[PDB]
Amino acid sequence: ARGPKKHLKRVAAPKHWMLDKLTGVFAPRPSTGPHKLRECLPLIIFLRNKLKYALTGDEVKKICMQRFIKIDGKVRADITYPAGFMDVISIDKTGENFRLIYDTKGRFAVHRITPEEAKYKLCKVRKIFVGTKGIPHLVTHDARTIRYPDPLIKMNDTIQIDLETGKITDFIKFDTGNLCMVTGGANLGRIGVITNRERHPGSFDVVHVKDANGNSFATRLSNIFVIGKGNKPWISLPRGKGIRLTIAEERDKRLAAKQSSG
Amino acid sequence: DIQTERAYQKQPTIFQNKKRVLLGETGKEKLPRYYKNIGLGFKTPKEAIEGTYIDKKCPFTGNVSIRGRILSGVVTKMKMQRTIVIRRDYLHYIRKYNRFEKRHKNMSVHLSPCFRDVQIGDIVTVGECRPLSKTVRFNVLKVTKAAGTKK
Amino acid sequence: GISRDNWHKRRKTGGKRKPYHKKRKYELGRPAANTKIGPRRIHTVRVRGGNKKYRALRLDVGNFSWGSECCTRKTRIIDVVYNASNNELVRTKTLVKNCIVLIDSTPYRQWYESHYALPLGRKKGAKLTPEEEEILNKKRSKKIQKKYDERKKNAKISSLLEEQFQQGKLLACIASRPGQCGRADGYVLEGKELEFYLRKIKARKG
Amino acid sequence: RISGGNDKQGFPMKQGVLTHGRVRLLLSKGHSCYRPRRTGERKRKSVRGCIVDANLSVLNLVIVKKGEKDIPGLTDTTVPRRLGPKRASRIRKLFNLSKE
RNA sequence: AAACUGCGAAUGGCUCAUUAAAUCAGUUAUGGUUCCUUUGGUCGCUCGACUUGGAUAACUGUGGUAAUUCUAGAGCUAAUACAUGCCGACGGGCGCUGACCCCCUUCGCGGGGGGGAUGCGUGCAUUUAUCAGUGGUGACUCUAGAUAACCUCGGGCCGAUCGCACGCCCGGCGGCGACGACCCAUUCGAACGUCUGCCCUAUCAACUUUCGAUGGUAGUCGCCGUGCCUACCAUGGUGACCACGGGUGACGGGGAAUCAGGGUUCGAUUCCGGAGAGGGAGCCUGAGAAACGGCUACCACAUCCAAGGAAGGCAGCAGGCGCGCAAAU
C-alpha cells in the first residue's frame, strides 16, 4: 500500500457494527473524525439498521443532506460521520433524541431520551496541556479542545458540557466510590463502582470494579468512563441498568417471557 | 585520564564557564554533575554522582531514556570498549515431544564506566533503549556479583 | 539514487542477507552540502511532509554567543582553522557542526565599551582618537556614575580572551547544522575550550 | 522580425537551440512545443534548431514597421473589436476616467 | 458544451517470480519523527485601500508533416491562476539608554527615596547562547517563563475571495454560510526498533574482516536513533545449543483434509500483511509513488512508414496463440 486505505470489506468490519454477510462486498468506512474506526458507528449504519428510517444507500443520503439531523448541536451532511460514546443525536421535526450507551452486551443500543437531558453531554478528559501564553488546555476523548478549565480537573476525570456554549458546568472526580462503566474489551456496558486501582510503573494500571449485585471484574486504566458520583447516575441508563446477566439467568428470563407471552 | 580524543567531552545541560566574582579559589573548580532518576524502582549509584567520566549513552548521565522491556542475563565477554555481551539462557517447549530444550541468544548491551566492578559471570539487568549502535539496544541498570569472589 | 537502507550489508553473525524489495522513497539520501564561504547562496529542497530545508552553500556572517556576560551579536565569518573529523576539511574552506573557526572581534568590543566602560583592544602607542566614548563618559549624574562604578567593580576576564581581543579575532565554535536550517550559529570558545583547541592547533601546525 | 517555423518533416523550432539541425531534448510544464497531459509530466521531443537553412517547409513573419505601399492581401480592411476589457481598472485605464 | 483553476488517480483489481529470523504472527515503544481530509482551539495579542499590476486559456484567423490524445508564429480577454501590497486596531503598556527634576536628620559634600521627555527592541513559526523552577510523567536536554540576538530574496502566518435572506439606528453599523491559512491536539495511518516462534541438508565445520565485519569519538545526509555514510582509533562479532554455505515442486498467517488418544499432509486461492507489473537502474509532480492504464536510457521481443521518423508493455475485465492431463461470455 502506497497510501491510506479508502475501502473496507464487510467481513473486515468490527463485530459491534452488527452487520450481515450476504448483502455486499464492502462496508461503510467512516470519514475521519473525533473517534477511532473500530470504536465508532456510521450514521448510515444507524439510520439503515437501527431506526429503520431508510432502506438503501441513497435514501440515507437524501435524509442526511436534507438538513434534518443535528449532531451535538451542529448539523452534519456526511453519511459516514463517526458517532461514538454519548454522541447526542437529535431529530428536530419529530422531536426525538437518542443517547448512545453500550448495553449489557458488546454493542450499541437505541435509547430515547428527553430533550432536557439532550442539552448536555458527559465526556472524558484525556490529557492536560499548557498553551502559548500560559493557557491551560484540556484534550477530551472526542477531541474537544477547551480553553481555561477548572483547576481541579485531573487526568482521568469526567466533565459535563452544555452543547450550546461549550463550557464546563459540573465535573466528577476520579476516586473510589464512584459509578463507572467500561468502554472496550471483554467487559463492555457493565455499570459498577471503582474499589481498587493498582499502580504498575511503566505499564498499564489495572483497576477493580464491583457490580451492584456482587460481581467483580478488572479492566485497564484506558478502559474507564466515570459516569456517576456514588450510586445515582448522572445520565439515564438503558434497560437492565448494565448488570451482565449470565447465560442461565438469560435463558430463564427468555423462557419466562415466552411463557407469559403465549 | 579524561579528554582522550580530538574533540572536547562535555555534558550539554550545565554551563561549565560561569563567571564568579573572584575566579580564584574557595568555591570554584568543583564542576556540577548532571544526573537523573531513571525510574522503575531503580536507584542511581554514587559513582554516577561523584564520577568524572563523560558519556552520551549512559542511562544516568546521558541523553538516553528507559522504556519498554526489562531483561536479565549473564556477562560472557568484556573485549570491546564501553559495551559488553550478555547471555540469556531460556527453555523452549515442543508440543509433539512433551519435553523442553534450552536455548541461548547472546546479544550486546551497553556498559557505562559507572559499573567498572564487573567480572565474567556477573548477573546484570538491562532496559530497552533507542538504537545506540548497529546491534546495541539495551542499557545496564544494575550489576550483581556471582558466587565466590569474596576479595 | 543514494540510499540509506540497512539491508545492503551483512548481519550480526557475518552472513549476507538477500534483498527482497528495491529502494523506496522514504529511504532517500542526498549529496553533501559542502558549505563554503563567500557571498550568501541558499537553496531550498522539498522534503517529506511538504516542508523545506535550507541548504546553505555559501555564507558571510553568523549569530554567535559570548557567554561570559551573555551577549549575542551578528558576526562575520573570517577563516576556518580546525576540524575534528577530517584533516582535508580545513584545506577546503568547509563549515560543519562543532567546527572551529575565527570570527571578528568588533561588535563584542563595542558592546564591552558601551556596557562596562573599560577599553578593550586599543594596544599601547595608539589611544582613542575619533572622540566618541569620552563623550558618552561625560554629561552624567552622580547616580549613573555610581551604577557604572558598582558594575565595573568586577570587570575581569580570561587573559587568552584579552590576547585574542588585541589580535582582533576570537576563536569560535559552530553549534548549528548549516545544511539543515541554512544558518551558521554557535558560541565563542572560552575557558578550557580555548587551551584545548589551541593545544590542538599548535600540535597540528607544528 | 522572423519568429517560429516548421521543418520539412514537420517539426517546430524551439527558441534557443543554437543548432541548424535537429536535437532531441526534454520538455516540461511552461515550455514551448509541449502541452502536458498529467501534472509534472515530462516527455522528450525532437525539435528544429534555431538557425534557418534551406531545409524548411514554412516560415512565419511579422510586420514591425508599416511602409507606404499597402498590400491588398495584408492591409485591406480593419477588423472590428471582438471583445473589450473586462476588469474595472482596465476600463478606467482605457477610457482615462477619474475617481468620480 | 468548451477551457482555465482546484481535487482524485498512491484507492480498487490480478498474480506468487523474489524472499528461510528476511516476510509474517502475538506482545511492546516513538520520552527517537512526518501525517491529505474531518473534528475542536487559535485566526484587532505584533507599535510599524469605496480594491493594485501584466500574461495566458476558451475564441477568431492562418499553416507544416504520410502519420499520434502531435503543435508555432498573429489579434483580444478573466480568477479562490501568477504576483505586489495598505488603513485600522493604536492609547498607551514591558524591558535597556536616559538628558534631568523634586524630599531629608546628616551644613553642603557622602547616602536613602519617587517622577521621568527623547532614542532602541517588542507576539506567534526557525536557530544559537544563558538563568530560575504553571502543569505532568516511573523517569527529560518536556511544556510554560525571563534575558541577548537571528529570522534565509529559491523569503512563515497575521483573509485585495464567493453566494442567500433582509435590514435597524445618524455615510457609518448588523444574521447564517462557502473557500483559504501559520501553529496545536485529534482521526486515517505509514515508517524504524524490542521479546519469542520458521522445511531439508555435514558428500557445507568454521564464517566475516582497511570493497564495514564489531564497538568508541566527531560530523554529512535523512522526517527522526543508527557504520546509513565519511576521517581517526581497538581487534573485535557468530559458531556443535548447527553459525556459515546450498536446495526448496517456499509468499507468511487466520485456516483445510484425515483423525480414539498423540499426530501426518496441504495452505497459488475471496479476510489480514508483504512483493512485482519483461528485468535491472534513475526521476518529476504530490501529504502520500522509486507509481509503470506517469516519465527517462539498456538489452530481449515487437507495430506503422514516402525510410526522414513516430509509437508500446492485459501477472485488470472479455478474448487469442503457445504450453499443456488440466480450467468459461
- Quickly give the structural class of chain C: alpha+beta
Oligomer: part of a larger assembly
The main β sheet of chain A shows up as: 5 strands, antiparallel
Coarse morphology of chain A: globular
What class, by secondary structure content of chain A? alpha+beta
Classify the helix fraction of chain A into a percent range: 10-25%
- Secondary structure tally: strands of chain A: 17
Side by side, the strands of the main sheet of chain A go 2-1-3-4-7
Total count of strands of chain C = 8
Could you give the order of the helices and strands of chain C? EEEEEEHHHHEHEH
Strand order, sheet with most strands of chain C: 4-5-6-7-8
Number of helices of chain A: 3
Main location (chain C): cytoplasm
Keywords (chain C): Acetylation, Cytoplasm, Isopeptide bond, Lipoprotein, Membrane, Myristate, Nucleus, Phosphoprotein, Ribonucleoprotein, Ribosomal protein, Ubl conjugation
Membrane topology (chain C): Lipid-anchor
Lipidation (N-myristoyl glycine) (chain C): 1
Structure description:
The structure is cut from a larger assembly and holds chains A (262 residues), B (151 residues), C (206 residues) and D (100 residues). With 262 residues, chain A is of the alpha+beta class. Chain A has three domains: 1-116, no CATH class; 121-171, no CATH class; 174-244, no CATH class. Chain A contains three helices and 17 strands. The termini of chain A are far apart. With 151 residues, chain B is mainly β. In chain B, strands 5-2-1-6-7 form a five-stranded antiparallel sheet, with no helix packed on it. A two-stranded antiparallel ribbon of chain B has the order 3-4. Chain C is elongated and about 80 Å long. Chain C is built from six helices and eight strands; from the N terminus they run ββββββααααβαβα. Chain C folds into three domains: 1-30, no CATH class; 31-105 and 169-206, no CATH class; 106-168, no CATH class. Helix content of chain C is 25%, strand content 22%. Chain C is an alpha+beta fold and 206 residues long. Chain D has one helix at residues 88-94, and strands spanning 22-27, 43-48. In chain D, 4% of the residues are buried. Chain B binds chain C through residues 3, 6-8, 15-17, 19, 21, 23, 134-135, and chain C through 12, 67-69, 84, 98, 154, 156, 190-193, 196-197, 200. Chain C binds one RNA strand of 329 nucleotides through β2, β3, β4, β5 and α5.
